[PDB]
């Protein structure tokens, strides 16, 4: 499932807007994830104490975690599919230490799409959302294959 250059440019043009304020986008995305799928919060200990959206917005550690995850994702997207080196350590840490199933990567992909659709209607019309979906599907397919190589069914 190879993206075209035109699809990559749609992905990168909306990501350029995320990069005006990665911290604020990360807060919105993690909060959307945790509200839509509370098991992703309650099962991981780093944030399991956060009870409300107000607590989530006030959490400096949640903000930092969102910046870390979105910056890693941006580096993957900028490789335009040539992301084998970037996926290796990420797959290992997410398949061995604290196991993050593919289902949860699907949930955060939905949260990314939801927040980009809300914040960026000027760069996230239907074609751009389809391109981002393709990019996130490729990411998940390749990390799922690495999970299996590493001994984790995902």
Author numbering: 0 to 153
Sentences from the study reporting this entry:
During the investigation of this reaction, we noted that the protein undergoes a peculiar change in color from the characteristic red color to green (referred to here as ‘Mb-cIII’ species) upon exposure to the BDK reagent in the absence of the styrene substrate. When crystals of Mb(H64G,V68A) are soaked with the BDK reagent, the color turns from red to green over the course of a few minutes to about an hour, depending on the crystal size. After optimization of the soaking and incubation conditions, a structure of the green complex was determined to a resolution of 1.40 Å. To our surprise, structural characterization of Mb-cIII compound revealed that this species corresponds to a protein complex in which the BDK-derived carbene moiety is transferred to a ring nitrogen atom of the porphyrin cofactor. As a result of this modification, the heme cofactor is distorted with the pyrrole ring C lying out of plane at an angle of ~30° compared to the planar heme. One of the heme propionate groups, which is typically located on the distal side of the heme, shows dual occupancies, with an alternate conformation of the propionate group being translocated to the proximal side of the heme. Based on these results, it can be derived that Mb-cIII is able to regenerate active Mb, and thus re-enter the catalytic cycle, via a reductive pathway that involves the release of 4 as byproduct.
In particular, heme-containing proteins and enzymes such as cytochrome P450s, myoglobin, and cytochrome c proteins, have provided promising metalloprotein scaffolds for catalyzing a growing number of carbene transfer reactions, including cyclopropanation, Y-H carbene insertion (Y = N, S, B, Si), C–H insertion, and others, with high activity and stereocontrol. Here, we applied a combination of complementary spectroscopic, crystallographic, and computational tools to investigate and elucidate the mechanism and catalytic steps of a recently reported myoglobin-catalyzed cyclopropanation reaction with diazoketones.
